[PDB]
Design a protein around this ligand. Structure first.
Ligand code: ANP
Ligand code: ANP
Ligand code: ADP
Lengths: 742, 490
């Protein structure tokens, strides 16, 4: 019999949320001789079966199958296991079903469960079922499970519209074999994909195949340290990993240990390891490690040092045993004992970090999973206006929105008539106004720290700068792809670039655009940060900056306003000193001593190129000078089009005339003409609306919906240059005399 | 070990520390090893408690009672000598000190060979590449690197491939090989090199990389290699040799190369202290770290201590006009102090280098200090040919190019500027090659005829139209006034 090649696949994560759709790739589907929508039969561990409608996708391999968590848990398999697939063309429509609830799930549910939950689920969707499964329905701010007990064309069928359901009986007990579905899994973690990938590949072999480490002498990693700001969900990630691998999970925590007597604390710390060890494979989680093992000089007492030393010897005695893994959580790497971050104790480090806007949209979708929002609610808006929020903030935001909806209406309205139950709660919807109320007030964003992400600016927002774009392509994207020519010719690529030119000519845009192109992370350090390090006399924080750059590779490190400190202590005349300062010296030091191939590109920008320290233009540092000049008419047209593409402007306006009229204008000045025109338009519109509201009321004829020629004329009479002729001639002397200095 | 002792009760800790010595003693000969000595015996004021001082004193009397017995040896391990109790580093307790240190590239190749001893690597794996690209790794890093490579090979293939068919055993594991791609994957990511400290080793630059400088080479031979071999004439004539030299000249003329080359010739270790280190000591107001520098020089003898950019601090506080002060600074004073008071025979040679020879403190040119001035001048055509050949010897260049014409065309060029012409030519060549490859890939695919495998005359012409001088005439005349007026100052 042939079973290995046509009938074997490997389980992985899902993208769809339906509990019956199983997704696979088109080559396997025309290899299995299966079309879309055909019910398929899956066999897994412990002779369990399931019937599921099939679907095709493209973002898969040719041996991976994507199934949801319900269907996966219904076969007793876990991720990375193998199953058997078959075509089942002999399913028929049912004529009698009987379903029961699980008593652990139904608590405080009053009314009847049929018409609120089982009526919209099997509505206009032919769903297949098999006797003895468990499915899940979401709604009324709860998630209720249901178990099938019988089927009339036994033991499996399809739910047709004329299939009666006898929802008769009392709740049934959850046995000791299946696991609950209110637990944590990888699906309940929004954002943070790369770090999840790292941790999953780091604990795959020791926890899935434990016997393999009795057949080879190879030491797997045993110390993992997660860090990030509080409220980023680290214990979540721990329980998730521990549940998806089926491993045992023990939990130790700081305050509970440090609130006991001496002997009891040591005895608990010892018993945790002993117990943990006995059951295998296991995971031990120590959250708030900073509390129990701080810096040495911060342990002013005596018993604290005993606890730290006890933890040290306990960690050091697991170098032989390969089935136990220890994970811990902190807030920053430099807040714990330095003798812990060594080989054998905590050698792997992961940084969770703050979510990006797409991650924020993911978290908002996670927490409103069974809330029954209205139709006007646009979560993209909310995800774009919560800059500085972590997962706990978004959870609290959704909860506050829900509580405002329950409070405002439907509780005082019915308090004088009847009681509350599930049917009036399921009909309750939340509106966008509640989200705006919760988003306006009572929400202190808890972030004043740096952000690292892939930016949103792209090449289509920059008018002109073609040669600069080409040279940026050459400097950034070649050695990260094709090392062949660089080894063949033996020459090493550069790792720095210095932009210069008149101010307000689009130097930050180029940096953001080239970071977005290569899909590499972006870090920006403005002028005030360097000046804060200068005044405060604490240049030991440059060491932190580069560290983040290193741990988030590939990356782009952008230093704008590099002439800030050189201008602070006098202009070109300066003080009695020279050109050497503290912070730029630390930059030179930290820049010279880094990896020759780590894929970290450093960009500088300055509009006063002469008063900069010439010791940074030496090789091995920023040594590729690029000149960003003032635009020309062919480029001014492109700048104006790029600025105006976002707002509705009429067709009678001619851009070419406005472009040729502004000679010597810097690109940062053509962008405020647009702002002034829009302010005039908004003023005119509000004035006309108020005139209509006050004319009769003390017929939809839009006064003007866009900008016209007269608004541009009024705004253009306020046109202002921003760079003089002498400044251009100074830049041009620097350009002509670019030779015969160094 | 430290933590196991410091995690007990008082009486139990003392009793274990005593029992260790008694039992150890009985069996003879023995060795007692105390790792993490820094933990159990830190500095006195860092023992804020009471029982810690009792433990340190107990260790002191236990060490002091083995002065009679000659069969027991005590070894200990720390991280730095100035992190433990000063009363331990005395005669009778811990009088011999060894520094292990960071491995060199040949040592790194040795460690990589140790740990892949039974791994069955493939044929394309070139460990020399890996040993040349892991600058900043210690033995544990290399062990982890090899283990990660092995685990990647076991994970990627041969585990998911056979999970749907059979089990794993020894015969399928011996047929498993690791490829160079796994080593590149492990070497790219997940490997934070844990080193930001100084390196000491014998360099790789030799005399065959320096074009010209014959008389300077001869005088360097005389100054460095004679007294370390033949003390006979120096005792017979009673005159003592010098121990310092000061290079000077225009910038970018190969002063670091000479230092590295003479260190490689005599097979002595090399230590380099750039400008930014001195400037961090100046701004940070912590010139107590010069004392550490010389210590390493002493413990790694024979050696060469090279101070480049010695005029950094003198230029930081104004130029020749400077501030209201004079020519004395903090760090250079510490250098004078630490340099005067060292052994007359330890074989440690100190080299200085500066391209602004006038604004330096004249108190360093006195005897017993750097008092052998050497002048590194701008090259000439016969030397420019050698510089160009030395730079181009590593890359494939065609035969139609004539170096003598390019050499005579560049007059007054400093050697650090002829080395970027080569870089520019190679960048143009690499751009041309990538462009032609992309043209072939996009021409038909939307027959091995190499477009150009080397550099030709046209690339050199295009790069040469960007030729830039870097030193003016007035600067040469300033150096020449200093050279002519080298007499009648000191
Ligand atoms: N060539 C250009 N194309 C498109 N927009 C431009 C261009 N030049 C300037 N801008 C606009 O000018 C704004 C400010 O310019 P910016 O990119 O900050 O240059 P900058 O000099 O580095 N910053 P600053 O010196 O403080 O003005 C940007 O937000 C753009 O909207
Ligand atoms: N005579 C020479 N022979 C060979 N290479 C040379 C010579 N002179 C300069 N170079 C090259 O110039 C480069 C930089 O010169 P370098 O030896 O650093 O002189 P330097 O003045 O001490 N350093 P710097 O002042 O920052 O340029 C070296 O890496 C060599 O490749
Ligand atoms: N990335 C995320 N995905 C899903 N939920 C998150 C995320 N980040 C934070 N949260 C939510 O906010 C809380 C933050 O986690 P935390 O308070 O650190 O863990 P716990 O209290 O479970 O130990 C959790 O209750 C979690 O529901």
């Amino acid at each position: 019999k042939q079973k290995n090649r046509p009938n074997r696949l490997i389980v992985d994560e899902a993208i769809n949320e339906d509990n019956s759709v199983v997704s696979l790739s088109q080559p396997k589907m025309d290899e299995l001789q299966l079309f879309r929508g055909d019910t398929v039969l899956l066999k897994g561990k412990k002779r369990r079966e399931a019937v599921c409608i099939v679907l095709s996708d493209d973002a898969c391999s040719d041996e991976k199958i994507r199934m949801n968590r319900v269907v996966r848990n219904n076969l007793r398999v876990r991720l990375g296991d193998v199953i058997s697939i078959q075509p089942c063309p002999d399913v028929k429509y049912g004529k009698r079903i009987h379903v029961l609830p699980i008593d652990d799930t139904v608590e405080g549910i009053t009314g009847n469960l049929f018409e609120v939950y089982l009526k919209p689920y099997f509505l206009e969707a032919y769903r297949p079922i098999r006797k003895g499964d468990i499915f899940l329905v979401r709604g009324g701010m709860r998630a209720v499970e249901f178990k099938v007990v019988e089927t009339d064309p036994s033991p499996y069928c399809i739910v047709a519209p004329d299939t009666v359901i006898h929802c008769e009986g009392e709740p049934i007990k959850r046995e000791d074999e299946e696991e609950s579905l209110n637990e944590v899994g990888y699906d309940d973690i929004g954002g943070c994909r790369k770090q999840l990938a790292q941790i999953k590949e780091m604990v795959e072999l020791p926890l899935r195949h434990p016997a393999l480490f009795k057949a080879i002498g190879v030491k797997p990693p045993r110390g993992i340290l997660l860090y990030g700001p509080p409220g980023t969900g680290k214990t979540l990630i721990a329980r998730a990993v521990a549940n998806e691998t089926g491993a045992f999970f023990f939990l130790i925590n700081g305050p509970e240990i440090m609130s006991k007597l001496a002997g009891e604390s040591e005895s608990n710390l010892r018993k945790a390891f002993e117990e943990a060890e006995k059951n295998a494979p296991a995971i031990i989680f120590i959250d708030e490690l900073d509390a129990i093992a701080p810096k040495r000089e911060k342990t002013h007492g005596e018993v604290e040092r005993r606890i730290v030393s006890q933890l040290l010897t306990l960690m050091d005695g697991l170098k032989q045993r390969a089935h136990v893994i220890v994970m811990a959580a902190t807030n920053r790497p430099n807040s714990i004992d330095p003798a812990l971050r060594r080989f054998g104790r905590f050698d792997r480090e992961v940084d969770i970090g703050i979510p990006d806007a797409t991650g924020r949209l993911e978290i908002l979708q996670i927490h409103t999973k069974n809330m029954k929002l209205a139709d006007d609610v646009d979560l993209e808006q909310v995800a774009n206006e919560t800059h500085g929020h972590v997962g706990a903030d978004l959870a609290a935001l959704c909860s506050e929105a829900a509580l405002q909806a329950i409070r405002k209406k439907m509780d005082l309205i019915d308090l004088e008539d009847e009681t509350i139950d599930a049917e009036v709660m399921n009909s309750l919807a939340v509106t966008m106004d509640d989200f705006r109320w919760a988003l306006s007030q009572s929400n202190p964003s808890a972030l004043r720290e740096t952000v690292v992400e892939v930016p949103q600016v792209t090449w289509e927002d920059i008018g002109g700068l073609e040669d600069v774009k080409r040279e940026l392509q050459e400097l950034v994207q070649y050695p990260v792809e094709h090392p062949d020519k660089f080894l063949k010719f033996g020459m090493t690529p550069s790792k720095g670039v210095l932009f210069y030119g008149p101010p307000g000519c689009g130097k930050t845009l180029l940096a953001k655009a080239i970071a977005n192109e290569c899909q590499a992370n972006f870090i920006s350090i403005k002028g005030p940060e360097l000046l804060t390090m200068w005044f405060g006399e604490s240049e030991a924080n440059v060491r932190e900056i580069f560290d983040k750059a290193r741990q988030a590779a590939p990356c782009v490190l952008f230093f704008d306003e590099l002439d800030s400190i050189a201008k602070a202590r006098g202009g070109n005349i300066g003080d009695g000193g020279g050109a050497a300062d503290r912070v730029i010296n630390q930059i030179l030091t930290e820049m010279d001593g880094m990896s020759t191939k780590k894929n970290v590109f450093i960009i500088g920008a300055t509009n006063r190129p002469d008063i900069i320290d010439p010791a940074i233009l030496r090789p091995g540092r920023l040594d590729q000078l690029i000149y960003i000049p003032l635009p020309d008419e062919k480029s001014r047209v492109a700048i104006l089009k790029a600025n105006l593409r976002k707002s509705p402007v009429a067709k009678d306006v001619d851009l070419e005339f406005l472009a040729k009229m502004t000679n010597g204008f810097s690109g940062a000045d053509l962008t405020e003409i647009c702002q002034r025109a829009c302010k005039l338009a908004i003023r005119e519109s509000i004035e006309s609306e108020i005139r209509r509201e006050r004319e009769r009321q003390t017929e939809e004829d839009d006064p003007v919906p866009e900008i016209r020629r007269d608004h541009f004329e009024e705004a253009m009479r306020f046109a202002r240059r921003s760079v003089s002729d002498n400044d251009i001639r100074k830049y041009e002397m620097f350009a002509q005399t670019l030779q015969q200095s160094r």
